[PDB]
Design a protein around this ligand. Structure first.
Ligand code: FPS
Ligand code: FPS
Ligand code: IPE
Ligand code: IPE
Ligand code: MG
Ligand code: MG
Lengths: 192, 328, 328, 192
């Protein structure tokens, strides 16, 4: 029913992000897990394959289950490993600190005479940069008054389109879907 | 034909509005992704090269505005490795345009010594025409030791490549015994990028209205104020820059709070990770975790002092290898 | 025949000198090892019992001096387990003398309620004549809930025995599941001695001129000012006490600095030992030493909160077992 | 030669401490390792079997070898395991903290059903209080202006005689030996 309508909405857009990024810069109060979860299931319904939740304080990483529970609530009411895969809760160390980790690993394989420094190719580091089973984000929704990525996966946002909304509190589908139209009309020339 | 900076004074309203914002927090370093040169040529019905040529005129115009506002360090995105995939005409045209200005900058030397302009071209310059690299190095070599202001031209640059090279420099130091894999730190990585001499930009301005960083200072602009303005770069105005500085002042309170917290958190995390390494070594080899010997405390102070020794020594060789550019 | 305190006001010079020292740091708790009763009887050519009898008169005299100086808590050494090895005559005589005063204290009740005198007899009282224990308990039970001042009589006491009993109370709590061996702490031990309700003495005064603690408040008088005066106890004067308070004020600066440093060091040592225990548990069970989960930080806050739970619960049962003295 | 004279000096005293305690309360400046070592060898010559060095800051425990080296210097000039046995450098945790340790051990043996709380006798704890191969100190020399033991082996100083000297800096044999005469004349009645 309503599942098909949301699937049709996403299908009509000229483009849909395969990986979605939800960056909350708001820190005046604790984030709204309901509004967050409500965005997440929306992404799943329109057809976004992966959704990453990020905050600078790490509040989400702390209260992971509180979100995943809220997700499953909305995920059933008016809508397991099914969301734990696509939904990944992130924190600042998932970016620069993880890039440091990758260097520490390659510096070690170099030191083991197994790899050569001359083999630290960009594509090589990318694979070593915890690619896991996630592609690079292509659409980030920056919720808040601060105009910054606050350190969200700096290696991966190289070509990500960054759309900003004034707050996530009491967010609405039309607000969330109007952002998706914007990305759909965005033009990537890839330097050509 | 045109040098890298202009001598234009500020206007009445521009100088008045300037004095006003200058009462608040000003950015020490602004970064520019000069986008829209080609689109601007189409609306003006002019050849693409002329659009890029105007783009340089604006870069000189905007740099003087920055100096007039006290913003002394400016980093700009001039050529991306990706742009090598454009038509030969356009790519050769951009190289030519670079060769012209870098040569004129040397012809207009001493004027560069006049204003202490330190030109620093940052990128994977080994991909450029040999002639252009010698002009770049020649320029960079003369404007070194100059400190009245700083301009960083990112020619044939991508942030991923800069990060990967910085990783290579750290693995190199491991290969030579200058570093251990455990020493590789976020701070250490900072001192290995091309921008090792430049503080992290306060503002990141991209024109044209694209809301993407296009592989530019990803590491550096993590907590930078991201200003995306619709204006096409060759039409950039002082007030455009003004508005960008405004957006910075609005968020500066919360931006700086987040920066300090990230830094304070990062330090705490290492100190916890280090104390654990010292604890794991002291838990092994028998010993006692604490006591009055303060053995953990003394061992910690040494690990840090020896940490810097390898790192600070490594940095000296990286800079010597860097300064080994007699390619001028 | 004589009660436990006297109503004598201070003299002119005594009140003047008092007002003077009272401007500086005054001791909150003074401890007395009333030594020299027997030697004083020989010089006065009087029976030994009369020496001890005078000793009590002085204890009442000295207590009023303390109250006149604002010193509200006083602990005294009245009978040592060691003193049980003296002649029966003397030992029985000391018991008799105790029975007389403890009985008169109850006869002079209400006067004890007048000045809020909380009499607390501390020791291994199970070694005393059954009659004397009931008198003690009767006294202690009535003067409880009184808080205007505090006197701790150490009858049949040795510090080693008090420390060992306090250890037993902690092993008891382990035996009943109220405690784990890891919980046994210096603080926890403090709450298990007989002096659990009394702060650590500021001054320790021994008379007669012996320079030994004779197994008295060894744990408690670790950072106490040790005053050894040659005067025989039954000849103690206000000025003797005055001089002792002087010696305290001289060293109070450095004494208090050393106390705070010991405390600050002790806390740091535990926090390091605790962080290591949390690290050893987090190093095992896979996991990650730090990260942003702040897992070590959260685990630490719980370990402390659960630490107090077992300890604070244990203390409630110890006090209930203690208050289970319907022996009055 | 001079060794016999110092041995005769100690032999003439009515009593000699088997275990000597050197408590430095002075904290205005770093202690004088030479003056400390000079006292130690004096104790050894007069015939003191054990010598314990103590300070509240733990400076001696930190710089143990600096003292033991200084000791060996004086120990030969004008005079191995030989001194490491009799000389024990102590710190605050050698007292109350060690008493806590002993409780933690007995509480554990109680919890193991191997021992009963009713068996935590005074003599039992004493053995459990790191008796090692040292008797209880009988003479403590308190060097400093502070009039306190500053937490020196509280369990063991139960009957120790505490003699005070104004400073250990530039100490003299006559000053050190006059203290030994004092202890020699001290009367222990053991509560009888
Ligand atoms: C440093 C120096 C002397 C010269 C170089 C600086 C100048 C004059 C031009 C930069 C060249 C490029 C690639 C600009 C990007 S705009 P675009 O090509 O993306 O235009 P579009 O976005 O497609 O409308
Ligand atoms: C609490 C109460 C009601 C009575 C007890 C307090 C009184 C009056 C006397 C204390 C008895 C003792 C053992 C005093 C030690 S002095 P000593 O025997 O060591 O004399 P000496 O040092 O040998 O000269
Ligand atoms: C020299 C510059 C400014 C290169 C980045 O701009 P692009 O125009 O190449 O970025 P895209 O819009 O093509 O992704
Ligand atoms: C009640 C008291 C004051 C017992 C301790 O005094 P002692 O007289 O028994 O101490 P010693 O001198 O005998 O060692
Ligand atoms: Mg472009
Ligand atoms: Mg006596």
């Amino acid at each position: 029913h309503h599942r098909m309508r949301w699937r049709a909405d996403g299908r009509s857009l000229e483009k849909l992000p395969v990986h979605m990024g939800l960056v909350i810069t708001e820190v005046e109060q604790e984030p709204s897990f309901s509004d967050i979860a409500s965005l997440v299931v929306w992404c799943m319904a329109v057809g976004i394959s992966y959704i990453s939740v990020y905050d600078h304080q790490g509040i989400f990483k702390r209260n992971n289950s509180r979100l995943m529970d809220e997700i499953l609530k909305q995920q059933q009411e008016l809508l397991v490993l099914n969301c734990h895969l696509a939904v990944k809760v992130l924190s600042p160390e998932d970016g620069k600190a993880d890039i440091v980790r990758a260097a520490q690993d390659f510096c070690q394989l170099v030191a083991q005479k197994q790899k050569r420094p001359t083999d630290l190719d960009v594509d090589t580091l990318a694979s070593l940069l915890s690619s896991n089973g996630c592609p690079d984000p292509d659409l980030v929704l920056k919720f808040g008054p601060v105009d910054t990525t606050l350190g969200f996966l700096p290696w991966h946002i190289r070509l990500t389109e960054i759309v900003s909304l004034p707050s996530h509190l009491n967010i609405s589908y039309e607000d969330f879907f109007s952002a998706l139209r914007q990305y759909a009309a965005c033009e990537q020339r890839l330097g050509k | 034909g045109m040098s890298w900076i202009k001598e234009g004074e500020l206007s009445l309203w521009e100088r008045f509005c300037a004095n006003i914002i200058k009462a608040g927090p000003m950015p020490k370093h602004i970064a520019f992704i000069m986008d829209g040169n080609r689109r601007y040529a189409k609306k003006c019905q002019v050849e693409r090269q002329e659009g890029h040529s105007q783009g340089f005129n604006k870069l000189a115009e905007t740099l003087r505005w920055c100096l007039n506002l006290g913003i002394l360090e400016v980093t700009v995105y001039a050529f991306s490795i990706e742009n090598f995939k454009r038509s030969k005409s356009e790519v050769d045209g951009l190289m030519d345009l670079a060769r012209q200005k870098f040569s004129r900058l040397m012809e207009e030397k001493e004027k560069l010594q006049k204003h202490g302009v330190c030109i620093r071209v940052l990128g994977d310059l080994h991909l450029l025409p040999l002639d252009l690299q010698e002009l770049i190095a020649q320029a960079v070599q003369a404007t070194k030791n100059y400190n009245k202001c700083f301009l960083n031209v990112c020619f044939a640059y991508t942030s991923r490549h800069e990060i990967s090279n910085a990783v290579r420099e750290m693995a190199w130091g491991v290969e030579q015994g200058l570093l251990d894999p455990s020493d590789i730190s976020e701070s250490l990585l900072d001192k290995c990028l091309y921008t090792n001499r430049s503080p992290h930009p306060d503002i990141l301005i991209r024109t044209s209205g694209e809301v993407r960083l296009s592989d530019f200072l990803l590491w550096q602009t993590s907590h930078s104020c991201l200003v995306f303005q619709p204006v096409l770069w060759p039409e950039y105005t002082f007030w455009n820059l003004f508005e960008a500085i405004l957006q910075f002042q609005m968020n500066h309170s919360v931006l700086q709070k987040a920066r300090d917290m990230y830094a304070e958190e990062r330090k705490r995390q290492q100190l916890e990770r280090d104390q654990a390494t010292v604890t794991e070594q002291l838990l092994r080899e028998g010993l006692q975790a604490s006591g009055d010997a303060q053995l953990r405390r003394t061992r910690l102070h040494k690990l840090s002092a020896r940490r810097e020794e390898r790192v600070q020594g490594f940095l000296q060789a990286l800079e010597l290898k860097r300064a080994d550019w007699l390619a001028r």
